[PDB]
Design a binder for these strands. Structure first.
Ligand SMILES: [Mg+2]
Ligand SMILES: [Mg+2]
Ligand SMILES: [Mg+2]
Ligand SMILES: [Mg+2]
Ligand SMILES: [Mg+2]
Ligand SMILES: [Mg+2]
Ligand SMILES: [Mg+2]
Ligand SMILES: [Mg+2]
Ligand SMILES: [Mg+2]
Ligand SMILES: [Mg+2]
Ligand SMILES: [Mg+2]
Ligand SMILES: [Mg+2]
Ligand SMILES: [Mg+2]
Ligand SMILES: [Mg+2]
Ligand SMILES: [Mg+2]
Ligand SMILES: [Mg+2]
Ligand SMILES: [Mg+2]
Ligand SMILES: [Mg+2]
Ligand SMILES: [Mg+2]
Ligand SMILES: [Mg+2]
Ligand SMILES: [Mg+2]
Ligand SMILES: [Mg+2]
Ligand SMILES: [Mg+2]
Ligand SMILES: [Mg+2]
Ligand SMILES: [Mg+2]
Ligand SMILES: [Mg+2]
Ligand SMILES: [Zn+2]
Lengths: 211, 156, 224
RNA sequence: GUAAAGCGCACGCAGGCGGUUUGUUAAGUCAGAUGUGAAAUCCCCGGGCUCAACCUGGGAACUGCAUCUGAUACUGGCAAG
RNA sequence: CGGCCCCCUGGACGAAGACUGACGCUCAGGUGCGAAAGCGUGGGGAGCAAACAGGAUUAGAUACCCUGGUAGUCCACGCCGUAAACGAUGUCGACUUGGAGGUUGUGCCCUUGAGGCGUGGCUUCCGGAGCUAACGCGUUAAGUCGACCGCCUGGGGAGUAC
């Protein structure tokens, strides 16, 4: 059967939101619209910086955006030039004084978004998928992950009938709310069709509530 | 330096309510080419792990064989299940004249000149079981001397 | 142990003539009241020669596993192992325990982790029911692996009480080449015991005699 | 036994086989010797066609048969148990 | 092969002793016996019951069910000679760990009814080695071996044609 979105259910227990501003119903909708379009713009512009999450927090007169990338030197380019450029850009979109403060991810193989998009980038380069997923899980657990499950669905190897293939290793206890299970979904558009990948990475129970 | 040898890889199946799932059984043989040889038979959902665990099992259970100069000491006819094997020592430089299963077992055990035939079923698993036990039943001259309380040249 | 020392304890006792095993004929003095009588003339020298080997093993830093699952004699065998700082199995034998050494290591690690966790803390972080459940699992694991938590590598010698009851253990040992020292009643099959002691295996007094003598010689072998 | 295959069961002639000891016989059996088993062909060592195929010298083999002389453990015959 | 009794008659087993002295095993052809159904002649025929008659059900019921009911079922004498005639396991002999029984002999010791030591015959169920494709067999072998006989050579055609 269907399964609840693992990140969406652990928001209260172990997962922080990705947009932590506050606003009453008067300007709630347009805040959402602005931040949606700005994060989609950033994704489209940093399709090579290998960004994992774009958290957005708004002071009353300002917009603050924190990027989580595996390649900090890339997004900041040379002497922080391009980051200032895109700061001007987000200033345009939000229509608001903007500030960008990048943040790095030390274990890029331990980021469901990162490993999922890597899997998709491999698939679109026409590589046998089983190799991709098993390499990903091996790398992840070699970097000391309590567990990881990878899942690919679609016309794998240009199959006329779409199949579902997954591979789990370690512990991935979705039902335990206390578990730090990072999850993300990516899609790869090939000539045959669009292939969907899902990644769960369990990094250990978090005893002691949210904080 | 243990010589290994894959000799059979079959795909077996088992039916379940949703569908019939498939597994692979690998029958392999291992031998130091110096009178020690074992055989392994592994099962796995896919062939490489199957042959891996088959060779692992074959690394244990390696029996000893009292050959001499890369050949047997006397004709031997081992029988296992529906397969009966007949092996006979041959002159120097004749080679391994045997079926593929028997040839694998023999050449990995280290015998160099022998004549073999396989009567009955040629099912490789039973064939290798038969020939391995038959090899285990050989009797070196000094073994006979011991169990008969005589000198070896007395038997010769 | 002297023949008189055994006889008073009752080492000469054996299972009914109705229930005996064929290979035990050489070790059987005779029958009385339809009861098999074990011959101490064979029992004493074999036990002494086994004590020699046990002293040798312990004097080369050997790890000794005392084995017995009798509900009467479990505590006796456990205390016997403690008196010589040796590992022990006093509860029902687990199938393939030596063969699945890798599997047991995870259980020992879990037992060590649970005891370490209780001392370290985080039980307060766990719910009171969860902390109690962790303690119950630790207690169950201690009841399961109290003797072999400090086993380290596979043992160097085995001492077995009622070898017929513990036949899985001896089959494993022979499969590993680990020597078996066992008290073998008339109903047992003596093939699996490399140093076989034919004697009563139920009576508390004779069992304690075996264990005490073995442990004295093991401490002696350790002392050097 | 269930894959092809124990007659439904029994008696019983011919036939096949036959407990144990001693003696004799030598039929079977074994050993030796002799005679014979055409040549070619097969095999081995050589020789001649420029090589080979082919031809060819010598040998080996022809595992058989027969006769005679012995052997007597085993089977057969005879006699006594 | 099943009430009881009488008359005639076959085999088996046990104890002890005597007797003969290989007189034995198997058996192609041959001979005999041989469930049920069936055939011939003649009796007998209560119950049961192919066929058949009828009533229901059903498209139909030519079946199952119901009401009847003939041959047959029984006896005498012949004939038939076939059955999943099966343990789907030919006969005879020898040897090979155990346990629980049933039945039928028989010896010794007991104070004996009892009871305990033994020793035979047949028979049942487990199970060791061993064997078997496996199932299973397992001292009553499907184990280990001898002697002789019968039988088999892919499935149909066909146990049919002549
Ligand atoms: Mg739901
Ligand atoms: Mg065949
Ligand atoms: Mg059939
Ligand atoms: Mg048949
Ligand atoms: Mg019959
Ligand atoms: Mg004779
Ligand atoms: Mg005759
Ligand atoms: Mg001659
Ligand atoms: Mg000629
Ligand atoms: Mg020439
Ligand atoms: Mg004679
Ligand atoms: Mg007389
Ligand atoms: Mg006949
Ligand atoms: Mg009739
Ligand atoms: Mg009539
Ligand atoms: Mg009439
Ligand atoms: Mg009627
Ligand atoms: Mg009608
Ligand atoms: Mg009459
Ligand atoms: Mg018939
Ligand atoms: Mg028949
Ligand atoms: Mg037979
Ligand atoms: Mg007969
Ligand atoms: Mg049985
Ligand atoms: Mg045909
Ligand atoms: Mg006909
Ligand atoms: Zn006991």
């Amino acid at each position: 059967g269907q399964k609840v979105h693992p990140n969406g259910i652990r928001l209260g227990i172990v997962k922080p939101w990705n947009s932590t501003w506050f606003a009453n119903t008067k300007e709630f909708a347009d805040n959402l619209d602005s931040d949606f379009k700005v994060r989609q713009y950033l994704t489209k512009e940093l399709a090579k910086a290998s960004v994992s999450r774009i958290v957005i927090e708004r002071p009353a007169k300002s917009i603050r955006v924190t990027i989580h990338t595996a390649r900090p030197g890339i997004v900041i380019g040379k002497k922080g030039e391009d980051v200032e450029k895109l700061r001007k850009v987000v200033a345009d979109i939000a229509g608001v004084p903007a500030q960008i403060n990048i943040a790095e991810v030390r274990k890029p193989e331990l980021d469901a978004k990162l490993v999922a998009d890597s899997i998709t980038s491999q698939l679109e380069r026409r590589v046998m998928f089983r190799r991709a997923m098993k390499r990903a899980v091996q790398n992840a657990m070699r970097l000391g992950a309590k567990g990881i499950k990878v899942e690919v669905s679609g016309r794998l190897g240009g199959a006329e009938i779409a199949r579902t293939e997954w591979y789990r290793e370690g512990r991935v206890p979705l039902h335990t709310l206390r578990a730090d299970i990072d999850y993300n979904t990516s899609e790869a558009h090939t000539t045959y069709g669009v292939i969907g990948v899902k990644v769960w990475i369990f990094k250990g129970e978090i005893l002691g509530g949210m904080a | 330096e243990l010589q290994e040898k894959l000799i059979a890889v079959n795909r077996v199946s088992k039916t379940v309510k949703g569908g019939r799932i498939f597994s692979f059984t690998a029958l392999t043989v291992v031998g130091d080419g110096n009178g020690r040889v074992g055989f392994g038979y592994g099962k796995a959902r896919e062939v490489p792990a199957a042959i891996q665990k088959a060779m692992e099992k074959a690394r244990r259970n390696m029996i000893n064989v009292a050959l001499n100069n890369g050949t047997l000491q006397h004709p031997v006819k081992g029988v296992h299940t529906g397969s009966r094997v007949f092996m006979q020592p041959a002159s120097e430089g004749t080679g391994i004249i045997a079926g593929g299963a028997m040839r694998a077992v023999l050449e990995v055990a280290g015998v160099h000149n022998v004549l073999a035939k396989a009567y009955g079923s040629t099912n490789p698993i039973n064939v290798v079981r038969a020939t391995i036990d038959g090899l285990e039943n050989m009797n070196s001259p000094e073994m006979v001397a011991a169990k008969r309380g005589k000198s070896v040249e007395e038997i010769l | 142990v002297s023949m008189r020392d055994m006889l008073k304890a009752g080492v000469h006792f054996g299972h009914q003539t109705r229930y005996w095993n064929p290979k035990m004929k050489p070790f059987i003095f005779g029958a009385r009241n339809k009861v098999h009588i074990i011959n101490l003339e064979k029992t004493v020298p074999m036990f002494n020669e086994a004590l020699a080997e046990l002293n040798k093993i312990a004097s080369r830093k050997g790890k000794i596993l005392f084995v017995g699952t009798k509900r009467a004699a479990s505590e006796a065998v456990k205390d016997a192992a403690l008196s010589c700082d040796q590992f022990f199995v006093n509860h029902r034998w687990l199938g393939g325990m030596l063969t699945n050494w890798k599997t047991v290591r995870q259980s020992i690690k879990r037992l060590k982790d649970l005891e370490t966790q209780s001392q370290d803390g985080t039980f307060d972080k766990l719910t009171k029911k969860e902390a109690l459940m962790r303690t119950r699992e630790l207690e169950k694991l201690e009841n399961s692996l109290g003797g072999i938590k400090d086993m380290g590598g596979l043992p160097d010698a085995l001492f077995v009480i009622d070898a017929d009851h513990e036949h899985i253990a001896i089959k494993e040992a022979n499969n590993l080449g680990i020597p078996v020292f066992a008290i073998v009643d008339t109903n047992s099959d003596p093939d699996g015991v490399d140093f076989v002691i034919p004697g009563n295996d139920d009576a508390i007094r004779a069992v304690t005699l075996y264990l005490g003598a073995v442990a004295a010689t093991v401490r002696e072998g350790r002392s050097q």
